[PDB]
Amino acid sequence: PFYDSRPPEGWPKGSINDMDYPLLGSICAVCCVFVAGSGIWMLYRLDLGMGYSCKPYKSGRAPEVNSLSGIICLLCGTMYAAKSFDFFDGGGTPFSLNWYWYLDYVFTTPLLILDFAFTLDLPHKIRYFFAVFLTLWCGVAAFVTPSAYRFAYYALGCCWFTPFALSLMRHVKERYLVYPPKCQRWLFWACVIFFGFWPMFPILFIFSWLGTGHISQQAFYIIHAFLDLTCKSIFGILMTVFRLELEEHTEVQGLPLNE
Amino acid sequence: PFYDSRPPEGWPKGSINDMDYPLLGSICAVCCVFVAGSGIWMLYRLDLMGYSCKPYKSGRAPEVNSLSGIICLLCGTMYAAKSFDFFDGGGTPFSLNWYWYLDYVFTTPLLILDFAFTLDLPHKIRYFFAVFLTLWCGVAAFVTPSAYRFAYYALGCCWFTPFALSLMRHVKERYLVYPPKCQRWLFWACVIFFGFWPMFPILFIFSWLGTGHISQQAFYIIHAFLDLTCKSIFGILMTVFRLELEEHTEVQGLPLNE
Amino acid sequence: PFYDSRPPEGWPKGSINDMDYPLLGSICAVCCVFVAGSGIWMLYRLDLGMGYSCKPYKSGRAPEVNSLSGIICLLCGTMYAAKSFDFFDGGGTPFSLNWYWYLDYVFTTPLLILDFAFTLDLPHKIRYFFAVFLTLWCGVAAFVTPSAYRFAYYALGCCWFTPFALSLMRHVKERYLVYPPKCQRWLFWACVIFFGFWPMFPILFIFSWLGTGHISQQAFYIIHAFLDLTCKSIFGILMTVFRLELEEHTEVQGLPLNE
Ligand SMILES: CC1=C(/C=C/C(C)=C/C=C/C(C)=C/C=O)C(C)(C)CCC1
Ligand SMILES: CC1=C(/C=C/C(C)=C/C=C/C(C)=C/C=O)C(C)(C)CCC1
Ligand SMILES: CC1=C(/C=C/C(C)=C/C=C/C(C)=C/C=O)C(C)(C)CCC1
Ligand SMILES: [K+]
Ligand SMILES: [K+]
Ligand SMILES: [K+]
Ligand SMILES: [K+]
Ligand SMILES: [K+]
Ligand SMILES: [K+]
Ligand SMILES: [K+]
Ligand SMILES: [K+]
Ligand SMILES: [K+]
Ligand SMILES: [K+]
Ligand SMILES: [K+]
Ligand SMILES: [K+]
Ligand SMILES: [K+]
Ligand SMILES: [K+]
Ligand SMILES: [K+]
Ligand SMILES: [K+]
Ligand SMILES: [K+]
Ligand SMILES: [K+]
Ligand SMILES: [K+]
Ligand SMILES: [K+]
Ligand SMILES: [K+]
Ligand SMILES: [K+]
Ligand SMILES: [K+]
Ligand SMILES: [K+]
């Protein structure tokens, strides 16, 4: 999808690409290591067994959708390794996972929402998946559009995220009462991350260089690195611990849900 | 995937991009509104089984039953993006109008999947990939500036001709199964399918990439009408067919003619 | 994704694109015909019935995942028809399935591994699918990267293929003892292809023009055409025959597996 490249003399001074590339690459490398390790731990813990007691699976293998958290974290860590390669190369490399904003997100966060929908048995999994997909593609279109019509694309995205976020939240409530207080605690701390950090991205768009111009692209990269540390890694760890508590309640102890 | 852009002085006069962009954008906006509303109604009606609105035993509809509305909403979102591109004068970096049939590789394969799920047609993956490859051959034909585009088109015609001849046969095998009311809705949906899907190959021949009889602006308008029919009207007919089938088999508990 | 094009005067003499394009196109056309015919035979044989006796399916149709071998072969044959179109056009065609190396592979070989995982009932099908996906995307990134960081991307790919290949192989062993000696023979000859030809691609990268410079891009295209003839077509035929033998053992004769 690439047409631009770093000029032979380097990025023009004062442009949005005139960033601290060693620092951005180091941040991306640290994020890659942390998120990939979190995904590896997620998959290893999933293969250990059900619940905190590590009860062996009857079929000998975990459910395939249960690997989504670790798979998404490992994919995000691989993309962050690629991002570190791009930043350490000075940016603007042909395979830049940093250039097109939210393009990487169209790969992780839809699946992430799918993982969420699978962990909480939320209805309309395909609907949520496609809502997230279209919101992220509207964001990509907004960030590649140089005219004012980018604010149209952003608005289009806000027309897909506002219902979805209001729908998911409602459904999450319907599931929250079902789970026991320990699984409820883990679910609460994960939903805090979800419904307090997913809205940040739309707000970050407004104050970015494509909006009011308060946040530079370098600061945007750092902020989104921290958000991916929270939205992928910490959220996936909270999902894994919630699943372990649920399996301990319902599979190891055989107790029923509050449904 | 984009390399071209609208020249600073505008599109060259007499080129295929020298179109009526306010008109194309208005048509795309109207199509966006209609298709998105049709998908919203499809999902709302799905969440309401059958005309009696019998509650689901699990409390939620089957996930594949949302495909019609999901596809219509995705097509409406793409038409909103198309209206943004046309109102910007075309050649916008995120142009869903530039690469022809590129948007279709997202909607119509899933659409065929939806069809295969509604009629319990065999070889759903086969049909999905046949549609996928036909549409990608069309994209390759439209981006190819040499005569080898007619090769790509031919390649697409090598994937659509069997598929359309296979699906039709399978549709016959399913048509006798359903009751006369579901048969009526299925007949009117299959009329749209087997009379409008062949139009695209014929439209290629007479387009600016063929004999040069249909301009790109007329192509955009014709395909907007086709997407109004192939996505929205077809999805409404599928939703009504599913409602009639659910009324026959779930609300009344009657068996199919199988 | 394309920015480059064949110069009006033709490819510069001595460049990596200064290849024998009629020969490459003829090879691609022959590969297209063979792989597409192999996929057509795979689907026809699958529709014939279960096993060598062609026992009719109880539901009247084959399992949908059983069509993966033929579907992948037909998709690869279609991409080879497109490759022949590109080569006969002189290369550098806007829709070039030859330009970006391993970009076509991100479509076939992940699904292929999925097919394998479905035929052998291997655990962690999503994990294997995403491992292959990320390995191939790392290869694409390495081949589009003009700096030394391509060897980073390659290394990243080697960080995803080395565990996966070591994991799959282990799981394959766990399945190998399950199947009868005839299915074991077909599985052995397919695993020979897998574990002796998949490692070739990483080795071919090192000696390619992007590495030590021993293998030209034309030779690379010919070698990968032969590999796709083996890794898609011959491997799919071996999978089809293994499935027929398994169906004859377990469905036609009703005999149990050695599990
Ligand atoms: C509404 C909206 C947006 C939404 C972004 C979201 C919801 C991003 C989530 C990212 C995550 C969860 C990343 C984790 O790895 C954009 C693209 C800013 C702009 C267009 C409209
Ligand atoms: C055979 C063939 C074609 C087929 C097109 C079809 C079958 C399109 C269907 C579109 C739909 C149903 C859109 C709805 O939103 C092309 C691409 C014209 C050209 C190459 C060969
Ligand atoms: C490890 C590695 C690679 C692996 C390639 C493989 C494993 C390719 C398989 C291809 C097949 C099976 C094709 C069949 O149609 C690359 C991309 C060379 C380079 C980066 C790292
Ligand atoms: K799960
Ligand atoms: K996991
Ligand atoms: K990332
Ligand atoms: K990018
Ligand atoms: K980015
Ligand atoms: K950028
Ligand atoms: K995760
Ligand atoms: K997660
Ligand atoms: K359905
Ligand atoms: K629907
Ligand atoms: K559209
Ligand atoms: K397009
Ligand atoms: K178009
Ligand atoms: K165009
Ligand atoms: K539809
Ligand atoms: K439909
Ligand atoms: K199979
Ligand atoms: K097959
Ligand atoms: K190929
Ligand atoms: K390519
Ligand atoms: K290639
Ligand atoms: K090339
Ligand atoms: K195959
Ligand atoms: K195969």
Short mmCIF file of C-alpha atoms in Angstrom, two decimals, chain B residues 85-253:
data_model
loop_
_atom_site.label_atom_id
_atom_site.label_comp_id
_atom_site.label_asym_id
_atom_site.label_seq_id
_atom_site.Cartn_x
_atom_site.Cartn_y
_atom_site.Cartn_z
CA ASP B 85 -14.26 9.79 -2.12
CA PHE B 86 -16.57 11.10 -4.85
CA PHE B 87 -17.42 14.30 -2.97
CA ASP B 88 -13.66 14.80 -2.56
CA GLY B 89 -13.32 14.69 -6.36
CA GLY B 90 -12.11 11.11 -6.71
CA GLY B 91 -8.60 9.71 -6.56
CA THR B 92 -8.63 9.93 -2.73
CA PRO B 93 -5.97 7.71 -1.07
CA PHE B 94 -8.69 5.58 0.55
CA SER B 95 -10.85 5.23 -2.56
CA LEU B 96 -13.33 2.36 -2.49
CA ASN B 97 -14.28 3.44 -6.04
CA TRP B 98 -10.85 3.29 -7.68
CA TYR B 99 -10.16 -0.45 -7.83
CA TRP B 100 -13.28 -1.98 -9.35
CA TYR B 101 -14.71 -5.09 -7.66
CA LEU B 102 -12.22 -4.67 -4.80
CA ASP B 103 -15.13 -3.81 -2.50
CA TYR B 104 -17.00 -6.82 -3.88
CA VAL B 105 -14.32 -9.24 -2.64
CA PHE B 106 -15.60 -8.30 0.83
CA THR B 107 -19.39 -8.43 0.38
CA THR B 108 -20.44 -10.92 -2.29
CA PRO B 109 -18.37 -13.94 -1.13
CA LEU B 110 -19.88 -13.60 2.34
CA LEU B 111 -23.20 -12.99 0.58
CA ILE B 112 -22.87 -16.32 -1.23
CA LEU B 113 -21.93 -17.84 2.14
CA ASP B 114 -25.11 -16.35 3.58
CA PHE B 115 -27.03 -17.84 0.67
CA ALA B 116 -25.40 -21.23 1.22
CA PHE B 117 -26.32 -21.02 4.90
CA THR B 118 -29.94 -20.05 4.23
CA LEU B 119 -30.56 -22.87 1.73
CA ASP B 120 -28.24 -25.45 3.34
CA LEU B 121 -26.34 -25.65 0.08
CA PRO B 122 -23.41 -28.09 -0.07
CA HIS B 123 -19.78 -27.04 -0.49
CA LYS B 124 -20.06 -23.66 1.20
CA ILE B 125 -16.28 -23.21 1.26
CA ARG B 126 -16.12 -24.15 -2.43
CA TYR B 127 -18.72 -21.54 -3.37
CA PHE B 128 -17.06 -18.93 -1.15
CA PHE B 129 -13.67 -19.46 -2.78
CA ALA B 130 -15.16 -19.58 -6.28
CA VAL B 131 -16.75 -16.16 -5.73
CA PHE B 132 -13.53 -14.91 -4.10
CA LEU B 133 -11.38 -15.97 -7.05
CA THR B 134 -13.86 -14.64 -9.62
CA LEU B 135 -13.85 -11.22 -7.96
CA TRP B 136 -10.07 -11.16 -7.64
CA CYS B 137 -9.78 -12.05 -11.33
CA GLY B 138 -12.07 -9.09 -12.02
CA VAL B 139 -9.90 -6.80 -9.89
CA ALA B 140 -6.81 -8.02 -11.76
CA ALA B 141 -8.56 -7.46 -15.10
CA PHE B 142 -9.53 -3.91 -14.16
CA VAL B 143 -6.04 -2.96 -12.92
CA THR B 144 -4.30 -4.56 -15.92
CA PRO B 145 -3.74 -1.98 -18.71
CA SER B 146 -2.65 -4.47 -21.39
CA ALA B 147 -4.67 -7.04 -23.34
CA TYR B 148 -3.86 -9.58 -20.61
CA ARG B 149 -6.75 -8.05 -18.69
CA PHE B 150 -8.95 -10.05 -21.08
CA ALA B 151 -6.93 -13.03 -19.88
CA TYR B 152 -7.82 -12.19 -16.28
CA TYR B 153 -11.44 -11.64 -17.26
CA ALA B 154 -11.34 -15.01 -19.01
CA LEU B 155 -9.85 -16.52 -15.86
CA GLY B 156 -12.78 -15.05 -13.96
CA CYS B 157 -15.17 -16.44 -16.56
CA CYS B 158 -13.49 -19.80 -15.93
CA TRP B 159 -14.50 -19.55 -12.26
CA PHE B 160 -17.95 -17.95 -12.50
CA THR B 161 -19.37 -20.10 -15.31
CA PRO B 162 -18.96 -23.42 -13.40
CA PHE B 163 -19.91 -21.88 -10.05
CA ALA B 164 -23.07 -20.28 -11.45
CA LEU B 165 -23.90 -23.54 -13.22
CA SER B 166 -23.19 -25.51 -10.04
CA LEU B 167 -25.02 -23.25 -7.57
CA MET B 168 -28.08 -23.09 -9.84
CA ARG B 169 -28.25 -26.89 -9.93
CA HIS B 170 -27.94 -27.10 -6.15
CA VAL B 171 -30.55 -24.36 -5.81
CA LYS B 172 -32.94 -26.53 -7.83
CA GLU B 173 -32.26 -29.42 -5.46
CA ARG B 174 -33.24 -27.16 -2.57
CA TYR B 175 -36.15 -25.43 -4.30
CA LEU B 176 -38.42 -28.48 -4.22
CA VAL B 177 -37.71 -28.89 -0.50
CA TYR B 178 -39.31 -25.65 0.66
CA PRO B 179 -43.04 -24.90 0.87
CA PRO B 180 -44.73 -22.81 -1.84
CA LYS B 181 -44.49 -19.54 0.14
CA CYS B 182 -40.80 -20.00 0.90
CA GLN B 183 -40.60 -21.20 -2.71
CA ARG B 184 -42.03 -17.87 -3.88
CA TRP B 185 -39.53 -15.85 -1.87
CA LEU B 186 -36.70 -18.13 -3.01
CA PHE B 187 -37.84 -17.79 -6.64
CA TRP B 188 -37.77 -14.01 -6.47
CA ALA B 189 -34.34 -14.09 -4.83
CA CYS B 190 -32.96 -16.54 -7.41
CA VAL B 191 -34.32 -14.35 -10.20
CA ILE B 192 -32.19 -11.51 -8.81
CA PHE B 193 -29.18 -13.80 -8.38
CA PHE B 194 -29.16 -15.57 -11.74
CA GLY B 195 -30.30 -12.53 -13.71
CA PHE B 196 -28.07 -9.87 -12.15
CA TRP B 197 -24.83 -11.71 -11.36
CA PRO B 198 -24.34 -12.45 -15.11
CA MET B 199 -24.74 -8.71 -15.80
CA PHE B 200 -21.27 -7.84 -14.42
CA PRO B 201 -19.40 -9.99 -16.98
CA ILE B 202 -21.51 -8.46 -19.76
CA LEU B 203 -20.91 -4.97 -18.36
CA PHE B 204 -17.16 -5.62 -18.51
CA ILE B 205 -17.29 -6.23 -22.28
CA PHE B 206 -19.02 -2.94 -23.09
CA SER B 207 -17.15 -0.85 -20.50
CA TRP B 208 -14.26 1.49 -21.28
CA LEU B 209 -11.94 -1.50 -20.77
CA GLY B 210 -13.78 -3.38 -23.52
CA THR B 211 -15.68 -2.06 -26.54
CA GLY B 212 -15.85 1.36 -24.86
CA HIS B 213 -19.64 1.78 -24.86
CA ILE B 214 -20.17 2.37 -21.12
CA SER B 215 -18.22 5.12 -19.38
CA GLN B 216 -16.85 4.81 -15.86
CA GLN B 217 -19.49 7.22 -14.53
CA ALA B 218 -22.27 5.13 -16.05
CA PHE B 219 -20.48 2.06 -14.69
CA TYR B 220 -20.57 3.54 -11.18
CA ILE B 221 -24.28 4.36 -11.45
CA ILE B 222 -25.12 0.91 -12.86
CA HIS B 223 -23.15 -0.84 -10.13
CA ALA B 224 -24.79 1.34 -7.48
CA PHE B 225 -28.18 0.13 -8.72
CA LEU B 226 -26.88 -3.46 -8.84
CA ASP B 227 -25.60 -3.24 -5.25
CA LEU B 228 -29.00 -1.85 -4.28
CA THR B 229 -30.48 -4.99 -5.85
CA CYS B 230 -27.80 -7.62 -5.21
CA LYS B 231 -27.16 -6.64 -1.58
CA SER B 232 -30.24 -4.90 -0.22
CA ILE B 233 -33.20 -6.31 -2.16
CA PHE B 234 -31.63 -9.78 -2.19
CA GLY B 235 -31.01 -9.57 1.56
CA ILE B 236 -34.59 -8.48 2.19
CA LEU B 237 -35.85 -11.40 0.10
CA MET B 238 -33.55 -13.76 2.03
CA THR B 239 -34.82 -12.36 5.34
CA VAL B 240 -38.45 -12.82 4.28
CA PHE B 241 -37.65 -16.34 3.02
CA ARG B 242 -36.06 -17.14 6.39
CA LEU B 243 -39.09 -15.73 8.22
CA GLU B 244 -41.44 -17.87 6.11
CA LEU B 245 -39.25 -20.94 6.66
CA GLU B 246 -39.18 -20.33 10.42
CA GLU B 247 -42.96 -19.86 10.46
CA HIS B 248 -43.41 -23.15 8.60
CA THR B 249 -40.85 -25.27 10.46
CA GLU B 250 -40.43 -23.61 13.88
CA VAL B 251 -43.69 -21.77 14.65
CA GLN B 252 -45.94 -24.43 13.08
CA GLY B 253 -43.47 -27.31 13.39
#
